[PDB]
Amino acid sequence: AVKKFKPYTPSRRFMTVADFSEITKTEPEKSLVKPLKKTGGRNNQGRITVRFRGGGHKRLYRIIDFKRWDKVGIPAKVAAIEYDPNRSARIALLHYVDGEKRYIIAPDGLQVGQQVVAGPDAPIQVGNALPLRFIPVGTVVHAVELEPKKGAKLARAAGTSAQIQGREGDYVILRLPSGELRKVHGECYATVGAVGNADHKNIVLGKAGRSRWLGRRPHVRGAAMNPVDHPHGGGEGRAPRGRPPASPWGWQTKGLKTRKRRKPSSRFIIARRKK
Amino acid sequence: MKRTWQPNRRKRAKTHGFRARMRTPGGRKVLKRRRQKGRWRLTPAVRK
RNA sequence: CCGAGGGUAGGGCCCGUGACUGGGGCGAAGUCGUAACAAGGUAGCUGUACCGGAAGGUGCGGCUGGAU
RNA sequence: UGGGAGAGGGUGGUGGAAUUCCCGGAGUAGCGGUGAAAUGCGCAGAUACCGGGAGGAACGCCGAUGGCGAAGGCAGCCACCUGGUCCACCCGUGACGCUGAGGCGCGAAAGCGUGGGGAGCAAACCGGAUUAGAUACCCGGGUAGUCCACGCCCUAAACG
RNA sequence: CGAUGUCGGCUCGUCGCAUCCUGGGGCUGAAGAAGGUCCCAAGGGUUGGGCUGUUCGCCCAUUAAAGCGGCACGCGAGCUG
RNA sequence: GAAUGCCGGCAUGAGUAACGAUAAAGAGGGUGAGAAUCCCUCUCGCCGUAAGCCCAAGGGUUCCUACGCAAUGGUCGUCAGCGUAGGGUUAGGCGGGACCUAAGGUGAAGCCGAAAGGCGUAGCCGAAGGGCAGCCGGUUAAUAUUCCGGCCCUUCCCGCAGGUGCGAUGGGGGGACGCUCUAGGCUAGGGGGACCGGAGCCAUGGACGAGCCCGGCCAGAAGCGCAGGGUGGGAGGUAGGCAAAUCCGCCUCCCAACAAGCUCUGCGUGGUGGGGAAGCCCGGGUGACAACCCCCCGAAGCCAGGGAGCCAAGAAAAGCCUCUAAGCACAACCUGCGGGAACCCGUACCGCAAACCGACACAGGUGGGCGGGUGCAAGAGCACUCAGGCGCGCGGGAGAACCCUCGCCAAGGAACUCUGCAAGUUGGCCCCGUAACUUCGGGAGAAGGGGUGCUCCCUGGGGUGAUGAGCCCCGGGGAGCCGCAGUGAACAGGCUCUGGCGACUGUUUACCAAAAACACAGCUCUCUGCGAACUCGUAAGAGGAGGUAUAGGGAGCGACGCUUGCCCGGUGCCGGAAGGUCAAGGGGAGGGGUGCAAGCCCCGAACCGAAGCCCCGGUGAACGGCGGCCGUAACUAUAACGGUCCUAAGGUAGCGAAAUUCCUUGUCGGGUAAGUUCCGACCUGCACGAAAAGCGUAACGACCGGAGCGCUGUCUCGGCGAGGGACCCGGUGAAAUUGAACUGGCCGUGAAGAUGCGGCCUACCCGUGGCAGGACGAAAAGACCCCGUGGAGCUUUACUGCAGCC
RNA sequence: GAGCUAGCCCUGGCCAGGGUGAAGCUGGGGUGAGACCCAGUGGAGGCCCGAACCGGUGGGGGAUGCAAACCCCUCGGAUGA
Numbered sequence A: 001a002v003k004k005f006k007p008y009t010p011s012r013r014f015m016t017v018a019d020f021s022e023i024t025k026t027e028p029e030k031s032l033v034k035p036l037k038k039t040g041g042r043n044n045q046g047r048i049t050v051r052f053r054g055g056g057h058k059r060l061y062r063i064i065d066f067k068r069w070d071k072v073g074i075p076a077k078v079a080a081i082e083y084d085p086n087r088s089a090r091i092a093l094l095h096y097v098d099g100e101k102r103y104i105i106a107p108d109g110l111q112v113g114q115q116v117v118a119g120p121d122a123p124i125q126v127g128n129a130l131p132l133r134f135i136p137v138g139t140v141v142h143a144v145e146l147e148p149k150k151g152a153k154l155a156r157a158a159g160t161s162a163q164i165q166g167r168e169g170d171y172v173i174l175r176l177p178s179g180e181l182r183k184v185h186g187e188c189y190a191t192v193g194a195v196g197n198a199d200h201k202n203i204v205l206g207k208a209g210r211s212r213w214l215g216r217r218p219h220v221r222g223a224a225m226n227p228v229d230h231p232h233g234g235g236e237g238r239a240p241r242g243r244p245p246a247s248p249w250g251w252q253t254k255g256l257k258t259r260k261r262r263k264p265s266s267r268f269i270i271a272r273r274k275k
Numbered sequence B: 001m002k003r004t005w006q007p008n009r010r011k012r013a014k015t016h017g018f019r020a021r022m023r024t025p026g027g028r029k030v031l032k033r034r035r036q037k038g039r040w041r042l043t044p045a046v047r048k
Numbered sequence C: 001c002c003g004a005g006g007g008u009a010g011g012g013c014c015c016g017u018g019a020c021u022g023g024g025g026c027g028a029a030g031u032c033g034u035a036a037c038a039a040g041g042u043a044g045c046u047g048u049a050c051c052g053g054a055a056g057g058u059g060c061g062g063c064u065g066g067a068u
Numbered sequence D: 001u002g003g004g005a006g007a008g009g010g011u012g013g014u015g016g017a018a019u020u021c022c023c024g025g026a027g028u029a030g031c032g033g034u035g036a037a038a039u040g041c042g043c044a045g046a047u048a049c050c051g052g053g054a055g056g057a058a059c060g061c062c063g064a065u066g067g068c069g070a071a072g073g074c075a076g077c078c079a080c081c082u083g084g085u086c087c088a089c090c091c092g093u094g095a096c097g098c099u100g101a102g103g104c105g106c107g108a109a110a111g112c113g114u115g116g117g118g119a120g121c122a123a124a125c126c127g128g129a130u131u132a133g134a135u136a137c138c139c140g141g142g143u144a145g146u147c148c149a150c151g152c153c154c155u156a157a158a159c160g
Numbered sequence E: 001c002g003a004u005g006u007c008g009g010c011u012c013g014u015c016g017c018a019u020c021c022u023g024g025g026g027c028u029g030a031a032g033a034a035g036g037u038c039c040c041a042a043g044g045g046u047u048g049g050g051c052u053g054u055u056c057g058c059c060c061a062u063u064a065a066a067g068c069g070g071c072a073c074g075c076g077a078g079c080u081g
Numbered sequence F: 001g002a003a004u005g006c007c008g009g010c011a012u013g014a015g016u017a018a019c020g021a022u023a024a025a026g027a028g029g030g031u032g033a034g035a036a037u038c039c040c041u042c043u044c045g046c047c048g049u050a051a052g053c054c055c056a057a058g059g060g061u062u063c064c065u066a067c068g069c070a071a072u073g074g075u076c077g078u079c080a081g082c083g084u085a086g087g088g089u090u091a092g093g094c095g096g097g098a099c100c101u102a103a104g105g106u107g108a109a110g111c112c113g114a115a116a117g118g119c120g121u122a123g124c125c126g127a128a129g130g131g132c133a134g135c136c137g138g139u140u141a142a143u144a145u146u147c148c149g150g151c152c153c154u155u156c157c158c159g160c161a162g163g164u165g166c167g168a169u170g171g172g173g174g175g176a177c178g179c180u181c182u183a184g185g186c187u188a189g190g191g192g193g194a195c196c197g198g199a200g201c202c203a204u205g206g207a208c209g210a211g212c213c214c215g216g217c218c219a220g221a222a223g224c225g226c227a228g229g230g231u232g233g234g235a236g237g238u239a240g241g242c243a244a245a246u247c248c249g250c251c252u253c254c255c256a257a258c259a260a261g262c263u264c265u266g267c268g269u270g271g272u273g274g275g276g277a278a279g280c281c282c283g284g285g286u287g288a289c290a291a292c293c294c295c296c297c298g299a300a301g302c303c304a305g306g307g308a309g310c311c312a313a314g315a316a317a318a319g320c321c322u323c324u325a326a327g328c329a330c331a332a333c334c335u336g337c338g339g340g341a342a343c344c345c346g347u348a349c350c351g352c353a354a355a356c357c358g359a360c361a362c363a364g365g366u367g368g369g370c371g372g373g374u375g376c377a378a379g380a381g382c383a384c385u386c387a388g389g390c391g392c393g394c395g396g397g398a399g400a401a402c403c404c405u406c407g408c409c410a411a412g413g414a415a416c417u418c419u420g421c422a423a424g425u426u427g428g429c430c431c432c433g434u435a436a437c438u439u440c441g442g443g444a445g446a447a448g449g450g451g452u453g454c455u456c457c458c459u460g461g462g463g464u465g466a467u468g469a470g471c472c473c474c475g476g477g478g479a480g481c482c483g484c485a486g487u488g489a490a491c492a493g494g495c496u497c498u499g500g501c502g503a504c505u506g507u508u509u510a511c512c513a514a515a516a517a518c519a520c521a522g523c524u525c526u527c528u529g530c531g532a533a534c535u536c537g538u539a540a541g542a543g544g545a546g547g548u549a550u551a552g553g554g555a556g557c558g559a560c561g562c563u564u565g566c567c568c569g570g571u572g573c574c575g576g577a578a579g580g581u582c583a584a585g586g587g588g589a590g591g592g593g594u595g596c597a598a599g600c601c602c603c604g605a606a607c608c609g610a611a612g613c614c615c616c617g618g619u620g621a622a623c624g625g626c627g628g629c630c631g632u633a634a635c636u637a638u639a640a641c642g643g644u645c646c647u648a649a650g651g652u653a654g655c656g657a658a659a660u661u662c663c664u665u666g667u668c669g670g671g672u673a674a675g676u677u678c679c680g681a682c683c684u685g686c687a688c689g690a691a692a693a694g695c696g697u698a699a700c701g702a703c704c705g706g707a708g709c710g711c712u713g714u715c716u717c718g719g720c721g722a723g724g725g726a727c728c729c730g731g732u733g734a735a736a737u738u739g740a741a742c743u744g745g746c747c748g749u750g751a752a753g754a755u756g757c758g759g760c761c762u763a764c765c766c767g768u769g770g771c772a773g774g775a776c777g778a779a780a781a782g783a784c785c786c787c788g789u790g791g792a793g794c795u796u797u798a799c800u801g802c803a804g805c806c
Numbered sequence G: 001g002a003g004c005u006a007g008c009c010c011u012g013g014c015c016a017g018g019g020u021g022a023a024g025c026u027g028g029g030g031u032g033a034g035a036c037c038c039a040g041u042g043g044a045g046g047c048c049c050g051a052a053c054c055g056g057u058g059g060g061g062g063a064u065g066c067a068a069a070c071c072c073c074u075c076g077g078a079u080g081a
């Protein structure tokens, strides 16, 4: 439940911060971090290839277990729930009875001291990981592989979930967080439950400095630039677009579809996204 | 006010130095040119 | 020392007045439509919401103080 | 103490009918709608029919002139949690009562905020008719909203 | 056009006279006082302020009067800007 | 002889400007051919969170000493960062390397690219980060944590002893981490002493004093004391840590728990080794057997990997410890002692500057540490001062205009002016008190006022210590004294009312614009199912992201409040297995050339044939657009109402002479004696209007308007005074400019504005201080304007290509 | 050519002093239980004043400059984008 501040500065008036209620442990597992190499948005040529990036807080990467079929049948206790600056979800620490320790992303409802397990035999219970074909239809799942053994690709951001709708041969029908209906191979893994920290969408950054902390440098409007710079650049005074609204590189940016035509995964999308 | 020449012995040697010139086609042409002209110094002096 | 009161500053209440503006009351024979009283020709009334020259209309819910 | 009836309330779950949509099959020259029509839809294969899928909302018969609640109001079925109430016995306390300015809480619909949801319905709105006009009544569309959670609003022909 | 800096102000003047005032006159529909109109006259004088960048103009309070023009629409190797 | 020609030489301006911070000088004595300028002394002034000291970078002998003065030095020069010569930089412990990794760079494997080359895992390189053993004093003209003295320490090799399953590039532990706030105890540093040591001093009216002045330490091994940091012990199981593992991880049992034990660090003490003032006497010597103690204040430094809170969630690797594998257990490693061994580079000097960056000995620029004392509430602020360092490398006079910087001003008080521009005013702290409005924070230092020094007396609490004295820190009550005046000097808000714009703190045109511009939280549309979209790249490969629709790209709008209407005919985008059109290809009715012929060769209709476009729909917080004429009410005027033409549809709410209104200073009201501006209204809005958002909005603003109070040299209207210049004398000595000049006024004339022509007038020859009317004065081959079939940026439904995509 | 300047990456460092006084916590009141109220504690913030530091608002000087952007007065930020 997001926390408000009293308006004792102009920015505190609107700032909201996460309650951090579910966090039980406040420093990371030293065996499961590595340095996160900040890019600033620059590629191996040194060129900015994603604008308006840099200057955010320092972070360590928490190694996340996106397979779990690594360790079928080996149960695990929920040691803690920790903060991860690298994603929107929270992460949960697992002390396997194996003695091995791993992080997974924390679904909604998971409690410290509960057990989790992964496998075709697993109980349909929040925190468990099964191949899609064994989860009952109608179940809300997250951290879904897209192809067998390639790692959880879908429904990982805070609050998201995919819902199983039906089965067709070797394939199950998922409704993704976007609302698209897709066929995912029944051997792909998924974790029962939805991702936690749903209140994440209700955070009000509150002032410009907050975006800077996150690595988000100021975004400048095409309309504000010059014709050398952008289709919307120039004009005496302010100016409407005066042409179909366009990106810095000239392509149209209000409706123009961009998914590749003959993409082979088209055979497996059933219905494009909603709303 | 701050002017444009802010000497830096490491900066000088790593940018204009003999080994930088040799690692690159443009750099070796530089050395070949200054040799052909008979320059006493093929590369800027930096005390290191 | 206190002290009528005089002065500087700042508030509170009341009265009168003000370009213009808001509706209200009233005024023998103005203009527009016809909402209500008969099932008043779409039963009416109603809180609310939205809309419309105007009465009003419509939605949601409610009342019978509704007719057959 | 022992009993009873009930859509009293809150939470979670879940069942079938129907409408809309989508996919398949079968099929053809209209369907729809009205006072009569037109807009609309349909040979780019609609309507009517059969199988499949998704989703929302509301609960047919029972049902009553019935039941419950202080009022607003409450209706598929299941479980849990909880209120009020009636009766029998005549067992306990011994007038401990009535009302109640202020206060506090509840309070149909509409409306408002933040998320979600959205089948049907439908203010506004658009179109077709009607008409002198028709910012209406009738028709084809249609956005809020109607639904859920939390928080506001506190009104009524809140009536017996 | 191998540059003759451009509006207004300020400062500093100087000149013209088709004279705003002061001096001298004729005519009057000049009783007096006060005016009108024309003639002579450039010696001197010709205020302070509100508004606007303003020049100009309008206004306030006065005044004998609150003149109008030229000097590269006088004057930026004098200032302002 | 001309090219604003080119190279050089030399003139003019001119003995002119200037001689580089207004911190400041004077005298005596030396030296020398020569002295304001060098050396010495006395006096004066200037810096002192520096203008003092210590590192780093950069510079590269500039350091020290002798001998010099042609040039360099803005004058002088005997001097010097200058010329000549000699001398000077000493390390196992300080810095870097023989150690480690970070970004990045490089790169066996591998990938890609016409060539050149581009990528790339490991690995390697890469430091001001991690890691690692030296402190104090003495010495030289010049180096010192380096030499020397004292006391400590590290690593390598070999040996002796005791101990142990020894053994690694492998496993594991550790290293290892943010921001704000902060405890305890110390140390650095500082203040005081009636106590301790000291050469002396008694002045000019007083003082021989519990008098003045000066000083009262630094380093130190083991132990020990104080304060801290780090750390559970044992057993059983074990499938995880890419082999193994007694280690680590996970599970269970027992015992210990704010402790203790063990270990590590700081501080104190500590054998011992050092230092040691003023003053006086020529850096030295004495003082001196110097003394070296007590109390107080006290860090931001130390104990440290301490504690708490918070969200934006805070390097790696080695050293180190532990575990084992090959191995080897005559070894090997561990602990203690002993001897031996211990390389390369830097080290001078400048270092907020005359030695570095600015062409200069250039008022500019340059990162880290130390930065004393007193008073002012604090402080690194301010004034004065210590240590230390300077008086800024031209001076001497004069006492004009004028200029700069500064002080004061009768009466008035914004009348100045585009504008209160500028300058006054106000000014710290304590107390009393404080409005509309508001998002309840604020607005607020609102406004406005009172207090402020010194002396005596009484007294409350706190720290240290002991509970007391002393010292030190916050206060309270009473009585008095002096002055024009008590934050007595210096540092230190003028205030209010009311509009426009932008919510806000931020950002910007380096060097004419700081704003209303950009950004900004927030809102909406749209793309993207992950080998994502998108971006860079020929590609490989990267970014996106080790992210996954509560996410990421693109666009506009821009806190918040109340809202955001109507038009899909045109352009865009989205949907549409029909129809039309449509390229290469298929197909081959049917012609043609040639050959004696089989054949060879050429053209070719119908028909099939993608995307695109046509066509059918949807779509506005997509590009965009949102009417005209005529008539009508019982006074008039005006039209709720009607007629008709047109459109895709005719502008809704809200707002309006506006950052928009032409006519315009519209009209009316307010404010003023007077108001083209301002504020409030009206609405015939030339030419507002709803995310190029509409209307508001508390708070905010070096933004732009209007008014008032305060107070002023802004002004009426100017006066006087100060210093730095201007002026004069001695020294040094530029510049742009320049056809040559023996270079006057008027009225004319002239290519139309004449020193230079005509006529006339005026005028002895040459300077110096001043002023700017002319020389169409200087500067810059007009930047406005045109011209050139000149150029370049930018745009699009101009033309034609190309990338990219289909 | 990024030793100037712009952005980002890695690793270090710096920000005197004073003021305001959020959440939370404690206690007290309150209630059926709550909300909530008071006091204390606490020490938040693109909070306030002001040096270092970073700037460059207005004016004046300078204009063959001390300087090819400087000097004086004044003024903005100063725990943060």
Ligand SMILES: CS[C@H]1O[C@H]([C@H](NC(=O)[C@H]2NC[C@@H]3C[C@H](CC(C)C)CCO[C@H]32)[C@H](C)Cl)[C@H](O)[C@H](O)[C@H]1O
Pocket (backbone or CB within 6 Å): E003, E005, E006
């Ligand atoms: C800045 S002064 C600087 O430039 C000056 C130059 N003037 C001129 O060129 C004038 N020529 C006529 C033109 C007319 C216009 C008429 C107007 C209506 C446009 C006015 C402008 O100029 C004048 C700039 C353009 Cl004023 C002089 O060269 C001066 O010698 C030098 O010092």
Ligand SMILES: [Mg+2]
Pocket (backbone or CB within 6 Å): A003, A004, A005, A006, A012, A013, A014, A015, A016
């Ligand atoms: Mg808040």
Ligand SMILES: [Mg+2]
Pocket (backbone or CB within 6 Å): A006, A007
């Ligand atoms: Mg609040």
Ligand SMILES: [Mg+2]
Pocket (backbone or CB within 6 Å): A019, A020, A021, A022, A023, A090, A197
């Ligand atoms: Mg949480």
Ligand SMILES: [Mg+2]
Pocket (backbone or CB within 6 Å): none
């Ligand atoms: Mg690690």
Ligand SMILES: [Mg+2]
Pocket (backbone or CB within 6 Å): A037, A038, A039
């Ligand atoms: Mg990366």
Ligand SMILES: [Mg+2]
Pocket (backbone or CB within 6 Å): A044
């Ligand atoms: Mg790279």
Ligand SMILES: [Mg+2]
Pocket (backbone or CB within 6 Å): none
């Ligand atoms: Mg490269």
Ligand SMILES: [Mg+2]
Pocket (backbone or CB within 6 Å): A049, A050, A051, F535
């Ligand atoms: Mg991008």
Ligand SMILES: [Mg+2]
Pocket (backbone or CB within 6 Å): A040, A041, A042, A048, A049, A050, A051, A052, A053, A054
């Ligand atoms: Mg970027």
Ligand SMILES: [Mg+2]
Pocket (backbone or CB within 6 Å): A086, A087, A088, A157, F547, F551
């Ligand atoms: Mg994320």
Ligand SMILES: [Mg+2]
Pocket (backbone or CB within 6 Å): A082, A083, A084, A085, A086, A087, A088, A089, A090, A091
């Ligand atoms: Mg997280």
Ligand SMILES: [Mg+2]
Pocket (backbone or CB within 6 Å): A146, A147, A148, A183, A184, A185
């Ligand atoms: Mg699949």
Ligand SMILES: [Mg+2]
Pocket (backbone or CB within 6 Å): A201, A202, A203
């Ligand atoms: Mg969000």
Ligand SMILES: [Mg+2]
Pocket (backbone or CB within 6 Å): A056, A057, A058, A059, A085, A213, A214, A215, F312
């Ligand atoms: Mg971040």
Ligand SMILES: [Mg+2]
Pocket (backbone or CB within 6 Å): A216, A219
């Ligand atoms: Mg953003």
